[PDB]
Symmetry: C3
Subunit: 129 residues, 3 copies
């Protein structure tokens, strides 16, 4: 059965404006170099980092709505415990660590991401047999 | 198995333009006060009501494409029979009444919504064991 | 279980700019007449063809991420082998031919599409019992 579903839409300009601020949730996710690059909204880096961000958000939303979430407020370091990386063809891959990793060992996480010029989006489906 | 899938994209400005017109499908959904608020496209109310609207649409699309739909034209008062509300953390919740409620008693409806500044979106998955 | 998931976002203006170029992937999909129409970004044709395009892309992404894909690079004529058509109510329908048709005989493909004025989107879920 499906465990949780998440969708996220990212304004690429709003992302560029927020991405390169110290100690943001982005800083736990992306390197300082990546965030500097992505601060230019016209850049390839902004488009692809914003889609990576949408994917992570979508995954967190699916988690939030699921039975693995107890309190309504996200736990500590959910943002370090969930990573979404892309292969050299831009296909996303979910990587778990910490408590999330242990808790979600027996569930599958499906994720897809996309972007146009102004907007990025992703969908996540958490699923179990 | 999955019963039906739906996605919906809402222009927040186009929504603001349409939301506050008498006897629209919106009027069956949202209060006059909510619709007045949402008629300003720059408002928090427009952004969040448009995402609520996208969610409801996504759910109706999933229903339309499913075996629970006979005629291609939507039934009477589908719009009163399906409600999507948000908690104080903005997490959506589906509420059914009328015929839809009776018909869909044994199926789960997963829904997720999101918005940026100009656009809102939602996904719905209807699913059964 | 879910076999593969895909989401796609299409800039309707960028689509109009690309859709009517000879020997593009679009040319394998849509007729010359359809592509001429869709080259005007303000047109109904651009909006609906771009949503049809998003759907096909979403389906291909779901396929790419699935076990039915061996090499990371898409196979020959994936674009002729997968078709997404719309009924007169604008509900999408997947049509398979060639190798894809044979390979995916026992899996279901769920698809949904949508558009606003500037943007189109679709989601695809490939699923098996
Ligand atoms: Ni890109
Ligand atoms: Ni909001
Ligand atoms: Ni249309």
């Amino acid at each position: 059965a499906i465990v949780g579903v998440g969708i996220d839409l990212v304004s690429i300009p709003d992302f560029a404006e927020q991405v390169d601020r110290p100690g943001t949730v982005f800083a736990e996710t992306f390197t300082p170099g990546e965030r500097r690059d992505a601060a230019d909204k016209s850049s390839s880096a902004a488009r692809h980092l914003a889609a990576r961000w949408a994917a992570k958000e979508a995954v967190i939303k699916a988690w939030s709505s699921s039975r693995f979430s107890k309190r309504p407020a996200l736990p500590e370091g959910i943002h370090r415990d969930i990573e979404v990386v892309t292969d050299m063809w831009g296909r996303p891959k979910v990587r778990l660590s910490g408590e999330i990793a242990k808790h979600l060992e027996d569930v599958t996480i499906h994720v897809s991401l996309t972007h146009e010029d102004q907007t990025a989006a992703a969908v996540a489906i958490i699923e179990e047999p």
